[PDB]
Every structure is written in structure tokens, then in C-alpha cells.
Amino acid sequence: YELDYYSKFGHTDNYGNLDLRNKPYTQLPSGFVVKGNLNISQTPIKKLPKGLDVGGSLEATNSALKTIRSGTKIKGYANLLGSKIESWPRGIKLGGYLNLTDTPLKTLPAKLRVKGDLSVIRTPISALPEGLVVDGNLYIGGSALQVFPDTMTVKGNIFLGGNKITKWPSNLTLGGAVAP
Template sequence: MIVVYPTLAMNEPASQFVQDLRFHGYIDNYGNVKLRFAPITALPAGFKTKGYLDIEASDIVRLPRGLEVGGYFNAANTALKQLPRMKVGGYINLTNTQITRLPPNLVVRGDLSLVNTPLTALPQRLFVEGNLYLTNSPINAIPDDIYIGGNLYIRGTNIQEISPDLRIEGQVLPALTQ
């Protein structure tokens, strides 16, 4: 007989959160946590996962401080308004969220999607190893102290010019006409 011990999930003691995961999501053997469409409204303080965290279209409205995600973080189509200081090992998808603020010094180890968000300004010292998608956002300027390792997508924004000091390894798409 095989017995599953929910008290060992994520090396955390048994909690209501772990019980909710049994019904609304899953944790696999690789440390991935999938909570798509889950009616869970919050993650516990000190939440860490070795794999990805997928909360797309869930009822989560706030994230705990110190959140650590070893893989990608997908929060598309949620009611999130801001991100805490957090560590993410892969891309971050915030498409169709209510994000209005990102933390300074945010490091993204893949792409960062801010498509269809009300975000009006990027944080200081943003570091994106992949592409930065700003499509259909009200952003009108890119700070000089950010780094983009891939392309910068600005269709549907109010961006009129890009500083020559901006560090972009890829292209600005669509290209700005001067």
C-alpha cells in the first residue's frame, strides 16, 4: 500500500494550503506547482518551489514577500496589481493582469510579458535576459538603466523614442521611425 503524505509537500508542515492543492492544483516530483483556474486567493508566506509556478486565471490577488520560483512564473489573466521582491529562475508572464508596479532591480531569467497591463512605468535597473513585451500598455518611456537581452516589443505603446544608451541586444519592434 502506498501512502501519500501531504505534510511532506514542499518540505512544509501540513496546512490548509497543502490541502487546497490536493483539490485545486498539483505539485509534481520536480517541484512544479500548477494552480491554473484555482479558487485559491493567496500563497503562504515563505512560499518556495524548485520548479515553475503557474497561477494563470486563478483567484490569487496577492503574492507573499520573498517568493522564490526555480522555473518560470505564469500569472496571466489574474487580478495581481503588483509583484513583491521575488526570485524567478525563468520567464515571467503577466499578460492581462492589473499590474501597476514592478519592484526595482527585478531580474528576469527569460522573457517578461507585460502585454495588456495598465503599467505606466518600468522599474529602475530592470534586467531581462530574454524579450520584453510591452504591447498594448500605456508605457511611454524606457529608463536608461535597464538591460534587455532579446527584442523589445512596443506596438500599442506611447513610446516615441529609445535612448541610444539603452542596452538592448535585440531589436525594437516595430522599429521607431524618426
């Protein structure tokens, strides 16, 4: 079934964080607003509603989340560890890091900006989008990436983690170090 207004109230804390862990909810109403953090870990939710607003961070670790629609506003970070997300939509306003470890993610939006750290660890992604900007640490360990785009920006450390990079960006300014 689907979450109602009264069922929403029974999964909210004092400061306004929605906890849906292991709960049997399949879809959320459109134009959904959360006062604080949102947790949809281990949920059978396969799609996030259009116009979704989260006043905190989105937690979807080891969930069945697959599709996020554009226009979603997230003030905190996005944690989609172990979910079933295959692509990242364009135009997501993310106020924090993006953790996509152990996901079937294949494609990323062009010129994507991550205000925090980025993770593509053990993902089947083949190539990073052109003009990528990362303000934190980039972990690509165990992924299928082997060629970086012509231009990219990482303001922290770059962790190869084991994968072999052959074509480095022509224009790259690094605020940290590169680790294998």
C-alpha cells in the same frame, strides 16, 4: 476550505507536481514545498503562503491569485496570465520568465531582474522601474507604457506591439532588435 496534507497527496503526480485546477482551495499552509511544478490555475486562491517553495514552475493562468509574499522560491518560470495580481513583491527568486499578461499589475520592483522573458502585454502599468534587466524578449504590446526609464537592459528583442515610446533610455545596450 484549505488544503490538507492528505488532500495534497491526491493532486500530485509521480515526479511531484501539484495540480489544483478548478479545485476549491482558498489558502495553502505556510512554508509550503513543492517537489516539481505548481498549478493553481482557475483557483479561488487570493494569496500565496509565506515561505512558499516550488521545485518547478508556478502556473496560475486565469486564476484569482492577487498577492504573492516575499521570500518565495521558484526554480522554473512564473506564469500569472489573466490573474488578479496588482503588484510584484521585492525579493522573489525567479529561475525563469515572468508572464504578467492581462493582469491589473500597476507597480514593479526597482532594478528587477528577469532571467527569462518578460510580459506586460495589455497591463495598466504606467512606467517601468529604473535599472530593469531582461535576459530574454520584452513584450509591452497593448500596455499603457509610453516612457522608458533612464537605464534599462534587454538582452533579446524589444516588442512595442503598438504602444508609442517617446522617451528612450539614455544608456541602453540591446542584443536584438526593436519591433513596433
